[PDB]
Amino acid sequence: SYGFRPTYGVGHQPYRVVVLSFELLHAPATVCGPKKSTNLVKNKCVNF
Amino acid sequence: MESEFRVYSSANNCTFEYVSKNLREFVFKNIDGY
Numbered sequence: 001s002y003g004f005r006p007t008y009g010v011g012h013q014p015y016r017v018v019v020l021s022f023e024l025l026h027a028p029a030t031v032c033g034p035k036k037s038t039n040l041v042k043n044k045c046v047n048f
Numbered sequence: 049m050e051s052e053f054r055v056y057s058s059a060n061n062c063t064f065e066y067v068s069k070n071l072r073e074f075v076f077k078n079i080d081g082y
């Protein structure tokens with residue numbers, strides 16, 4: 001067991017680690033990235 | 049009494065959840081994993 005204490009130096013204090021891992025077995029439309037705003041206007045020739 | 053759901057006895061590794069005369073029609077299809 002790691003016996004942690006507050007009076008340790010760096011390199012022995014407890015660090016928390018998380019790792020992400022992707023894999024595309026074959027899905028065609030799974031969770032993708034997100035998006036956001038951009039003020040809507042009307043009665044103007046615009047690129048939409 | 050009125051007790052039910054004797055369909056299965058195992059539900060492991062669930063990869064999807066969801067909760068929320070007369071003619072009741074359905075069309076089922078399965079294309080590209082959908």
Ligand SMILES: *[C@@H]1O[C@H](CO)[C@@H](O)[C@H](O)[C@H]1NC(C)=O
Pocket residue numbers: 060061
């Ligand atoms: C599916 O469940 C079995 C145990 O029934 C387990 O060994 C396996 O790791 C599970 N698969 C995934 C992807 O979690």
